[PDB]
Amino acid sequence: MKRNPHFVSLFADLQKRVAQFRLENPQVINLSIGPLNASVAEAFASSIARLSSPTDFGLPALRQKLSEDFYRGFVDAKEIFISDGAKVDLFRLLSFFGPNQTVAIQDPSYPAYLDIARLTGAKEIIALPCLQENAFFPEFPEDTHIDILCLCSPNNPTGTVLNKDQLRAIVHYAIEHEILILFDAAYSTFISDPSLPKSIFEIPDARFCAIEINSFSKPLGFAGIRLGWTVIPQELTYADGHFVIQDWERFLSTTFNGASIPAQEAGVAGLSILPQLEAIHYYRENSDLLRKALLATGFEVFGGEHAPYLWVKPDRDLFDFFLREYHIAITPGIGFGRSGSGFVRFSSLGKREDILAACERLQM
Amino acid sequence: MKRNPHFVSLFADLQKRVAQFRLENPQVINLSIGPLNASVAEAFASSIARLSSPTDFGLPALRQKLSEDFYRGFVDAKEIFISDGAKVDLFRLLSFFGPNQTVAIQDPSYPAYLDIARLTGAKEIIALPCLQENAFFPEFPEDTHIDILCLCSPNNPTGTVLNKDQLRAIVHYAIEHEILILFDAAYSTFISDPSLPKSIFEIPDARFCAIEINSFSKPLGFAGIRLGWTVIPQELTYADGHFVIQDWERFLSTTFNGASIPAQEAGVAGLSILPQLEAIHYYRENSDLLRKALLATGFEVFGGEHAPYLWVKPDRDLFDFFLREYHIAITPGIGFGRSGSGFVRFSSLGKREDILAACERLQM
C-alpha cells in the first residue's frame, strides 16, 4: 500500500504563534477569526420528539423552502441537494469531476479550495489575481485552457461581491471557453444591498455552466447545524451532451446517506426567521465600526458591507506589526495567496466589546 | 468538461417490481428490507438546549466512551475518528487511498463496496468466493496481487461472522502479501456469542494491516443519528514506513467538518444503554422464528444469530417464486453477486406480526 501521490503537496499556526505573543506580553483583541437561535432549537427538539415516537437528496419541505424563500423562485426544488456542509460538498464536487482538471481560483484564495483541488487530482491550479484597480474582477490568462473555475462571492478574504455585470461577464467568458463554474455563496446572506445578485442563477446563462454551493453555519445563528446544499441546473451538460444533474444523483446515492433530518427540520425554521436577524445587523455594525476607525487612523479599507471581512491596506512585516503596534491579531493577506501581498484580513465576527476596544487602539 | 470515466460502469428496482405483484395480486410479507430510543433523544435535546445558551475528529467524550465501552479497551481514543456514517467513511477511505488499487471483496457482496471501488478508481475488483463448504472463509486467488481487502463481518448478506481463527488467518495472509484490510463491523452489536471477535483489533497483528469502520444507525434504536466512526491503528504504515494515521488526520481536516455535536452527545447516551436492548433480542427472536419455520418447511438455513440476515437455500426462479408460493418478498442471493447463486437473503428487521405471518405461510 503505497502512500497517496495526490497527497504529497500540502497555516494556522498563526494562532499558536499568537498565544506566544500573549505568553510574552501579558499586559490583545483577536480579529483573525470567529448561540443557537431560539426558533431553530425548538424545531430541532420537536423534530427529535417526532423521532422518539413510533413510525435521498433532502427533506422535500427543505428543498422547497430553499426554492421559494432562499432562491426567490430562481431555482427549482429538484435542482437542490441537501448535504452536511459546503466544504464536504466542495470536496464531493471536485471529487465527482475526476482528476486532471485544470482549475482556476481567485487570488487572494480561500485556501481550502487549493487543498481540495490538489487532493482531488488537479493537473494545474491557476490563480486569478483579483485587485481593487480592477474592481476585483479576476484577471484571466490569455490563453490557458481552464476546466473549472471556483468562485467565492461574497469573497473570503476580500469581503467583496462580484456584481451582476461582473458575473454576466464571467458567465459569458465561461460558456465561451467551456469552463464549469463552481460558485460558493456561503456568505450570500450577508449581502445588504438588495440589487446585487445573491445567487449565480440570477444571471443570464449561468445554467449552462455553473453549480452553486451554500450553507447555513455562518449566517449566523446556526451553531451545531451540520447542513449545506448544492445546486445543479437541469440544463447543465458535459461536453458530450450528458446531464450533470443525472450523474450527480447516482454519485450522491452511492456515497452519502443525507443530512440529518432533525437538522433539516431545523433549517426550515431557520429559513423562516432568516431575513430578520439583527443577528447579522450586529456584524454589519462591527464592520462599520472597524471601517471608520480604520479610515480615521489613515488606512485603505475594502469589503465589510456584504461579508464579515474587512480587507485592509496600510511581507512578514504585517502579522507581528499589528499585534505589537495595536494589540490586534489579524490574518495577513499574503496568507490567502500571492496577490494577497500588502493587505490584511480583519474578521468582523466577534463580540462588540472587543470590536470597540480595537477601534480605540487607533487614536493617539 | 468531459464526463467521468470512473463513472461509466454502474437494483433495486426489486422493490418497484414487488409493488407490481401487489397491484396484480391484491388478495404479501416483505422480508427484503427494514423508533428513536428514549435516553438517546433526551440527550439529543439536552445537547440542543446546551447550544441555544451563550458560549476536529470527534467529541472527546465520544472517542473515549468508544475506546472503553465499545472497543473494551482494545482501541485508543486517539485512533478513533467520528464522521457522519459508515458509508461516507468507506467512500472517504477508498477515496483517500487513491485510484488504481486492485481491491478484493467477499462474494456474495454488499454492493456498495463494488460501486465505491469502481467510483474511486479501482484497477480491478476481485470477488472472493465465500461458501458454506469452506465455512465462508473467502477463497483467495493464487496468485494475484491485491491491494485492499474489504471485509464485512458480521456479513451482509450471509449473516455470517468470521471468527477468531479465521481472522488470524486473514491477517497473516494480509501482512504476508502486504494487503490493507478494510473491516466493516457495522453489525457487530448483533453478535450474541461473547467468544467471537467483535472488532478486528482483537486479533494478533491486525494493527499492522487493518482499518475498521462502524456506526450506530443499525443497532437499532438510533433512527436520525447521522453518526459513524473510523479506526486507524498508530502502527499502521504505508510501504515506505509513513504512518497512515497521520495522512488520515490531514485528509479529514481538509474535507470534513465533523459529525454533528448533538448527535455525538446522543451517541454517548446510546453507548450507555447499548448493551441492554432487547431492542435487538427482539430481532434475535425474529431470526429464531424464521429459522425454525424454514428448517421445518425443508430449507437450508444459514446466518441469523449474529446479524439480522438469514441466508437461505431451497436464477430468476427465486424472486418470483417466493412472492407467488409464499407471499414473502426476499432479496435473491445472485443479486449480491455471482457466488450468491441458489440462495436468498431474508431480512429479520421487521415487525413481529409479519415475521409470524411469514412463518405461517410455511405449513400446508
How does DSSP assign A227-248, residue by residue? -EEEE--TT-B-TTS-BHHHHH
- Taking Cα atoms as reference points, which of A268, A191, A193, A192 lies closest to residue A227? A268
Distances (CA, A) of B15 to A55, B12, B20, B30, B159: 20, 6, 9, 10, 21
How far is it, in rounded angstroms, from Cα A158 to Cα A136?
Answer: 9
Among A176, A218, A226, pick the best mutation site for testing chain B contact (most B Cβ within 10 A).
A226
Chain A CB contacts of B41 below 8 Å: 48-49, 51-52
Single-letter code of the amino acid located at A176: E
**Are the CB atoms for A174 and A209 separated by under 8 Å?**
yes
Q: Which residues contact A313 (CB under 8 A, 6 or more apart)?
A: A299, A300, A302, A342, A343, A344
Single-letter code of the amino acid located at A301: V
CA A263, B216, B131 angle in degrees (round to 5)? 135
Buried b (16+ CB within 10 A) or exposed e, A128-147: bbbeeeeebbbebeeeeebb
Q: Per-residue DSSP letters for B122-182?
A: -SEEEEEE--GGGTT---PPTT---SEEEEESS-TTT-----HHHHHHHHHHHHHTT-EEE
Q: How many CB atoms lie within 10 A of CB B350?
A: 18
Residue where the block lists cell 480583519: A346
CA A260, A261, A263 angle in degrees (round to 5)? 70
Residue where the block lists cell 481550502: A112
* Enclosing H/E stretch for B105: strand B102-107
Chain B CB contacts of A48 below 8 Å: 36, 41, 44-45, 48, 224
**Nearest residue of chain B to residue A98 (CA atoms):** B4
- For B21, phi then psi, to 5°, come to -55, -30
How far is it, in rounded angstroms, from Cα A141 to Cα A127?
Answer: 9
CB contact under 8 A, A4 and B37: no
Q: What is the DSSP letter of B305?
A: S
- For B244, phi then psi, to 5°, come to -50, -55
**Are the CB atoms for B213 and B184 separated by under 8 Å?**
yes
Is B358 annotated as a binding-site member? no
Coil, strand or helix at B86 = helix
- Taking Cα atoms as reference points, which of B305, B297, B311 lies closest to residue B360? B297
Residue where the block lists cell 429459522: B291
- Helix/strand/coil (H/E/C) assignment for every residue in B184-219: ECCCHHHCCCCCCCCCHHHCCCHHHCEEEEEECCCC
CB contact under 8 A, B256 and A88: yes
Single-letter code of the amino acid located at B79: E
Q: Backbone dihedral region of A203: left (phi > 0), alpha (psi from -120 to 50 degrees) or beta? A: beta
* Enclosing H/E stretch for A164: helix A164-176
How far is it, in rounded angstroms, from Cα B224 to Cα B362?
Answer: 36
The sign of the torsion formed by the CA atoms of B266, B271, B277, B279 equals positive
How far is it, in rounded angstroms, from Cα B76 to Cα B68?
Answer: 8
Beta bridge partners of A215: A228
How far is it, in rounded angstroms, from Cα A269 to Cα A219?
Answer: 14
**Are the CB atoms for B271 and B66 separated by under 8 Å?**
yes
How far is it, in rounded angstroms, from Cα A90 to Cα A110?
Answer: 12
Method: X-ray
How far is it, in rounded angstroms, from Cα B131 to Cα A205?
Answer: 56
How far is it, in rounded angstroms, from Cα B211 to Cα B247?
Answer: 14
How far is it, in rounded angstroms, from Cα A227 to Cα A264?
Answer: 7
- Taking Cα atoms as reference points, which of B71, B297, B284 lies closest to residue B159? B284
End-to-end CA distance of chain B: 62
CB contact under 8 A, A224 and B35: no
Domains, in order of start, for chain B: 4-34+272-364 (3.90.1150.10), 35-271 (3.40.640.10)
Binding-face residues of B in 270-329 toward A, CB within 8 A:
none
Q: What is the DSSP letter of B5?
A: G
Retrieve residue A142's grid coordinates: 490569455
Rounded to a whole number of angstroms, the distance from the CA of A359 to the nearest CA of chain B is: 24
How far is it, in rounded angstroms, from Cα B314 to Cα A294?
Answer: 81
Binding-face residues of A in 208-267 toward B, CB within 8 A:
223-226, 238-240, 242, 247, 250-251, 254-263
Rounded to a whole number of angstroms, the distance from the CA of B175 to the nearest CA of chain A is: 11
Side by side, the strands of the sheet bearing B210-215 are B80-83, B228-231, B210-215, B180-184, B148-152, B102-107, B124-129
* Enclosing H/E stretch for A252: helix A244-255
Coil, strand or helix at A59 = coil
CB contact under 8 A, A51 and B35: yes
Q: Does A12 touch chain B if contact means CB atoms closer than 8 Å?
A: no
How far is it, in rounded angstroms, from Cα A259 to Cα A213?
Answer: 15
Q: Resolution of this entry in Å?
A: 2.7
**Are the CB atoms for A278 and A127 separated by under 8 Å?**
no
Rounded to a whole number of angstroms, the distance from the CA of A330 to the nearest CA of chain B is: 22
How far is it, in rounded angstroms, from Cα B295 to Cα A188?
Answer: 63
Chain A CB contacts of B176 below 8 Å: none
Q: Does B8 touch chain A if contact means CB atoms closer than 8 Å?
A: no
Chain B CB contacts of A180 below 8 Å: 1
Task: Among A5, A44, A254, select the one facing B115 at the smallest CB separation.
Answer: A254
How far is it, in rounded angstroms, from Cα A284 to Cα A305?
Answer: 6
